């Protein structure tokens, strides 16, 4: 959900292989729950610069 | 919702006509729902000073 | 809820007598609703350095 804190907007982003850690499980669904690499250790800030 | 992060409390606050942009729809309800004028472009800070 | 903003994690913290205010009422449940002593007036910080 964006700046307007009332509604959400689903997007898509494509990571790479070495940028995700996935939770293994017996889930048969075609969707694989999977977090980011290091978002449970410390908040990571972008490099929104040149 | 207040500082105590629970048990929200309804308020009122009346604006002027030059401070709202309201979506137009076919809704018949007596309540017109809409947002601020520039709250979907950047956060606006109060001027809590003299 | 913790840093992974998708799930909850219950803890227990054992406070002291002089650091809690509890709601008074006709409730019969064995659980007593209480808040921190001074979190409805300001945000409190931790004496985080040594």
């Amino acid at each position: 959900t964006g700046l307007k804190r009332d509604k959400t907007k689903e997007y898509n982003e494509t990571w790479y292989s070495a940028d995700l850690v996935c939770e293994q499980g017996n889930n048969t669904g075609n969707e694989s729950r999977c977090y980011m690499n290091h978002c449970n250790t410390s908040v990571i800030q972008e490099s929104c610069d040149k | 919702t207040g500082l105590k992060r629970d048990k929200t409390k309804e308020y009122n606050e009346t604006w002027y006509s030059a401070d709202l942009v309201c979506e137009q729809g076919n809704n018949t309800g007596n309540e017109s729902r809409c947002y601020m004028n520039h709250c979907n472009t950047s956060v606006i800070q109060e001027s809590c000073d003299k | 809820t913790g840093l992974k903003r998708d799930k909850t994690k219950e803890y227990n913290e054992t406070w002291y007598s002089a650091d809690l205010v509890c709601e008074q009422g006709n409730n019969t449940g064995n659980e007593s609703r209480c808040y921190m002593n001074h979190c409805n007036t300001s945000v409190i910080q931790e004496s985080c350095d040594k």
Partner: antibody, heavy 140, light 111 residues
């Protein structure tokens, strides 16, 4: 092609209560919603209530508000619908039927502290399998 | 919230087309764009059979002659080449707000 089995017809005095029992082959109720419909001879169909297959949102109709109670056995093996305050107008054939729902989000307040505030509402779309029905006669 | 079904009584000559109307106007405060409406046919001595769901999609096994159309408040059900098998009462089921209700129904016979 799920099969629904309902209890036999009953005859009751005015002002008493009836408790119907409904079952689905293969415990289909554990994955599909449950509903209840009635109709009087020569009259239109009348809706009664429902209950989510997850068992979260349970309610009744405005007409029978407080007059009916819907309950199921653990595991959704059986579903029981109980009605009280019977009268002559209550004489109807009571039907047990399955279905599903479209649980969508109706509100959202991104709570920066703690979890997010979500509100969900259930809207009835699917009505696939109908039960044979139970005939109830309110008479002395 | 009420439902108006017209006409009450619709004699149809065999091989002719038929039109049924189920109108709802109390869509207070909205929620989902596609208001849920479901059409069912109850033949004598038979359980009601689903015909249309979401007001535009045919149900499984329904012949193409049964078509449901409409959006917003006014909806219509169109039947082509009516036959004896189509004799019965057509019910339109609101699927918007809790509690939900049946439609008063429209009676169709062979003229």
């Amino acid at each position: 092609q799920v099969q629904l089995v309902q209890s036999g017809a009953e005859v009751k005095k005015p002002g008493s209560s009836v408790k119907v029992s409904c079952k689905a082959s293969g415990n289909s109720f554990s994955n599909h919603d449950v509903h209840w419909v009635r109709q009087a001879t020569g009259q239109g169909l009348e809706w009664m209530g429902w209950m989510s297959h997850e068992g979260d949102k349970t309610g009744l109709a405005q007409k029978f508000q407080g007059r009916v109670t819907i309950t199921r056995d653990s595991g959704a093996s059986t579903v029981y619908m109980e009605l009280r305050g019977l009268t002559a107008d209550d004489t109807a054939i009571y039907y047990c039927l399955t279905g599903s729902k479209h649980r969508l989000r109706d509100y959202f307040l991104y709570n920066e502290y703690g979890p997010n505030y979500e509100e969900w509402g259930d809207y009835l779309a699917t009505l696939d399998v109908w039960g044979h029905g139970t005939a109830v006669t309110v008479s002395s | 919230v009420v439902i108006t079904q017209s006409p009450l009584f619709l004699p149809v000559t065999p091989g002719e087309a038929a039109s049924l109307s189920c109108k709802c106007s109390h869509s207070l405060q909205h929620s989902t764009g596609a208001n849920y409406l479901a059409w069912y046919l109850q033949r004598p001595g038979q359980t009601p059979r689903l015909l249309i769901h979401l007001a535009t999609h045919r149900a499984s096994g329904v012949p193409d002659r049964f078509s449901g159309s409409g959006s917003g408040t006014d909806f219509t059900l169109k039947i082509s080449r009516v036959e004896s098998d189509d004799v019965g009462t057509y019910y339109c089921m609101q699927g918007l707000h809790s509690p939900w209700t049946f439609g008063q129904g429209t009676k169709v016979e062979i003229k």
